[PDB]
Design an enzyme around this catalytic site. Structure first.
Site, PDB file in Angstrom:
ATOM      1  N   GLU A  42       0.833  -1.188   0.000  1.00 53.17           N
ATOM      2  CA  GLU A  42       0.000   0.000   0.000  1.00 53.17           C
ATOM      3  C   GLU A  42       0.878   1.252   0.000  1.00 53.17           C
ATOM      4  OE1 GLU A  42      -3.055   0.542  -0.364  1.00 53.17           O
ATOM      5  OE2 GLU A  42      -4.054  -1.317   0.195  1.00 53.17           O
ATOM      6  N   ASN A  97      -7.375   8.603  -5.446  1.00 49.04           N
ATOM      7  CA  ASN A  97      -8.225   7.522  -5.988  1.00 49.04           C
ATOM      8  C   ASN A  97      -9.024   8.102  -7.174  1.00 49.04           C
ATOM      9  OD1 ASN A  97      -7.677   5.486  -3.977  1.00 49.04           O
ATOM     10  ND2 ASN A  97      -8.967   6.654  -2.557  1.00 49.04           N
ATOM     11  N   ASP A 155     -12.059   8.210  -7.600  1.00 49.51           N
ATOM     12  CA  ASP A 155     -13.315   8.803  -7.189  1.00 49.51           C
ATOM     13  C   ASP A 155     -13.074  10.180  -6.581  1.00 49.51           C
ATOM     14  OD1 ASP A 155     -12.323   8.142  -4.582  1.00 49.51           O
ATOM     15  OD2 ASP A 155     -14.319   7.749  -3.864  1.00 49.51           O
ATOM     16  N   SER A 172     -11.264  10.687  -3.905  1.00 50.45           N
ATOM     17  CA  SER A 172     -10.857  10.599  -2.515  1.00 50.45           C
ATOM     18  C   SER A 172      -9.363  10.375  -2.595  1.00 50.45           C
ATOM     19  CB  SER A 172     -11.516   9.415  -1.839  1.00 50.45           C
ATOM     20  OG  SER A 172     -11.204   8.217  -2.527  1.00 50.45           O
ATOM     21  N   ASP A 228      -5.896   8.368  -0.524  1.00 49.32           N
ATOM     22  CA  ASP A 228      -5.529   7.395   0.493  1.00 49.32           C
ATOM     23  C   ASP A 228      -4.285   7.947   1.202  1.00 49.32           C
ATOM     24  OD1 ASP A 228      -7.582   5.665  -0.344  1.00 49.32           O
ATOM     25  OD2 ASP A 228      -6.231   4.379  -1.497  1.00 49.32           O
ATOM     26  N   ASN A 285      -8.451   5.392   3.306  1.00 48.94           N
ATOM     27  CA  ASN A 285      -9.280   6.205   2.408  1.00 48.94           C
ATOM     28  C   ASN A 285     -10.075   7.410   2.953  1.00 48.94           C
ATOM     29  OD1 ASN A 285     -10.629   6.944   0.160  1.00 48.94           O
ATOM     30  ND2 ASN A 285     -11.133   4.825  -0.422  1.00 48.94           N
ATOM     31  N   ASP A 290     -15.055  -3.576  10.502  1.00 51.38           N
ATOM     32  CA  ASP A 290     -16.270  -3.237   9.725  1.00 51.38           C
ATOM     33  C   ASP A 290     -17.008  -4.407   9.040  1.00 51.38           C
ATOM     34  OD1 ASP A 290     -17.652  -0.563   9.212  1.00 51.38           O
ATOM     35  OD2 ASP A 290     -17.145  -0.942   7.094  1.00 51.38           O
TER      36      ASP A 290
END
Ligand SMILES: [Cl-]
Ligand SMILES: [Cl-]
Ligand code: NA
EC number: 3.2.1.17
Length: 129
Positions: A35, A46, A48, A50, A52, A59, A101
């Site tokens: 990562e 990202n 979208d 967003s 990281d 995120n 989660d």
């Protein structure tokens, strides 16, 4: 800070990630490797919109606030910049919220694609933990 492989495993063990929610230390080390290459300052946009952040690329879409990710949540209740610190406490503490989660370590695309199923133990081989 660019962590050494064993140096990071040691920090991660001390914060209680070894087997957190069933995930052996080796998994957390492997995820970090792919990562962020162990670099606490790593940031990646990202598609979208967003971003990281940090050693575990948490995120901004759901986990930390960076003020530029429309309609996102700040579930770990922290500024994303806290996740770039030389001290991984904040990143770890939050990862614990993420991995719980239900959405286990699969929430880390790199872990699902490059660590899942592999011999993640090799990631801690030779480390004094
Ligand atoms: Cl935002
Ligand atoms: Cl799980
Ligand atoms: Na956010």
């Amino acid at each position: 800070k660019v962590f050494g492989r064993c140096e990071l495993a040691a920090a991660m063990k001390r914060h209680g990630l070894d087997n957190y929610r069933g995930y052996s230390l080796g998994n957390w080390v492997c995820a970090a490797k792919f990562e962020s290459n162990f670099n606490t300052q790593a940031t990646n946009r990202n598609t979208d919109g967003s971003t990281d952040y940090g050693i575990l690329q948490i995120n901004s879409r759901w986990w930390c606030n960076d003020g530029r990710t429309p309609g996102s949540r700040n579930l770990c209740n922290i500024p994303c910049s806290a996740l770039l610190s030389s001290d991984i406490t904040a990143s770890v503490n939050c990862a614990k919220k993420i991995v719980s989660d239900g959405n286990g370590m699969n929430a880390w695309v790199a872990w699902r694609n490059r660590c899942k199923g592999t011999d993640v133990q090799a990631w801690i081989r030779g480390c004094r933990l």
